[PDB]
Amino acid sequence: SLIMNKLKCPHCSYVAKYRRTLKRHLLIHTGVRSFSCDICGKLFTRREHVKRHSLVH
DNA sequence: TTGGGGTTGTA
DNA sequence: ATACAACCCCA
Ligand SMILES: [Zn+2]
Ligand SMILES: [Zn+2]
């Protein structure tokens, strides 16, 4: 693309409105996930995903 | 159920 | 401005 917007994702067409949303989005462009369930070991990209997941246990 | 879009808050 | 968050909602 020829979008020079500083909030455009370098890896896909996504363009953020907020700097912190771009930061969050960039975490989908990696295999390393920062959060884990201490019961079953599953790995999640967002902290809120572990909270939602806890209903499993 | 999960991944990632939204809008949003605090320090 | 950045470092952590939050809940909602669709797919
Ligand atoms: Zn992207
Ligand atoms: Zn678990």
Covered bases, chain C (protein CB within 7 Å): 1-8
Q: How was this structure determined?
A: X-ray
Three-class secondary structure of residue A22 per DSSP:
helix
How much distance in Å is there from the Cα of A10 to the middle of ligand 1?
A: 6
Contact A45, A28 (CB under 8 A): yes
Residue A6 approaches strand C within 7 Å at CB: no
Distance (Å, rounded) from C-alpha A19 to C-alpha A30? 18
CA of A20 to C1' of B10 (A): 13
What is the 8-class DSSP label of residue A14?
-
Distance (Å, rounded) from C-alpha A10 to C-alpha A12? 6
What is the 8-class DSSP label of residue A35?
E
Instruction: Output the CA–CA distances (angstroms, integers) from residue A55 to A23, A39, A51, in the order listed.
Output: 27, 12, 8
What is the 8-class DSSP label of residue A13?
S
Distance (Å, rounded) from C-alpha A20 to C-alpha A39? 29
What is the enclosing helix (H) or strand (E) of A5?
A: none
Query: What is the b/e burial string over A19-55, where b = at least 16 CB atoms within 10 angstroms of the residue's CB?
Result: eeebeebeeeeeeeeeeeeeeeeeebeeeeebeebee
